[PDB]
Every structure is written in structure tokens, then in C-alpha cells.
Design a protein around this ligand. Structure first.
Ligand code: CA
Length: 122
């Protein structure tokens, strides 16, 4: 499932100021990250990143591809490919708590200027 900008900001409302992050900032980031597609799958070196949040199996979830993964979010990477982004969000919170938003390269890159384009309400 692909989200529209507003449908997502909607579902992620209670994330604003979460860890001193700005919603628009985070929306901007997801856009460049997966284009808001829940089924986004990206193979990197050996490893892969999954879902809207493109959370890596090198460290965050468990995949047969990287048995040695620390599986910090303690979940199978397959859970990041369904139409329920709840679990995804819990993993995302975990990343934010431990790593920070710089886990996502698009942040520093393009989402710290004109986050205007990233607001919705109507
Ligand atoms: Ca999910």
C-alpha cells in the first residue's frame, strides 16, 4: 500500500515532537526513503531494507538473509511488508530512541529546509 502525504501525516500525528522531531521533517524523510510504499524492498550490499521505514535486517529485524542480526526490534522483517504500519512504527520509535533520525540519510540531505511542502490538513 502506497500512502498519500496527508494519509500518512494523519496516521503519524502523535509522532510530532517525538524525540524533539518535527512531523514535516519526518514526512519529508519517508518520501525520499520509500515514497510512502509499505512494500518497498531494497537490497544493499548483501542485506536488505524493508517497508515504508526501510528498516535494515543487518540490525533491526530478523531475516533468513542475515542470521547474525541483532534483531533489535525483535520481529521478523516480514512484518514490515503488510498493510499495518503499527509494528513498523514501534520499530521506528526504537530506532529514534537509540540511533536517532540520522538513521535515515534523507533527513540531513533534504529535510531541514522548506518542510512547508510537508504539511497537510484538508
Ligand atoms: Ca507492519
Amino acid at each position: 500500500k502506497q500512502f498519500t502525504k496527508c494519509e500518512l501525516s494523519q496516521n503519524l500525528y502523535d509522532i510530532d515532537g517525538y524525540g524533539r522531531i518535527a512531523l514535516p521533517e519526518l514526512i519529508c524523510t519517508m518520501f525520499h526513503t520509500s515514497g510512502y510504499d509499505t512494500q518497498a524492498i531494497v537490497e544493499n550490499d548483501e542485506s536488505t531494507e524493508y517497508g515504508l521505514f526501510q528498516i535494515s535486517n543487518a540490525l533491526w529485524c530478523k531475516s533468513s538473509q542475515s542470521p547474525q542480526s541483532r534483531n533489535i526490534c525483535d520481529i521478523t522483517c516480514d512484518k514490515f511488508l503488510d498493510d499495518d504500519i503499527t509494528d513498523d512504527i514501534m520499530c521506528a520509535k526504537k530506532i529514534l530512541d537509540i540511533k536517532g533520525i540520522d538513521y535515515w540519510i534523507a533527513h540531513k540531505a533534504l529535510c531541514t529546509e522548506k518542510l512547508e511542502q510537508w504539511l497537510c490538513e484538508k
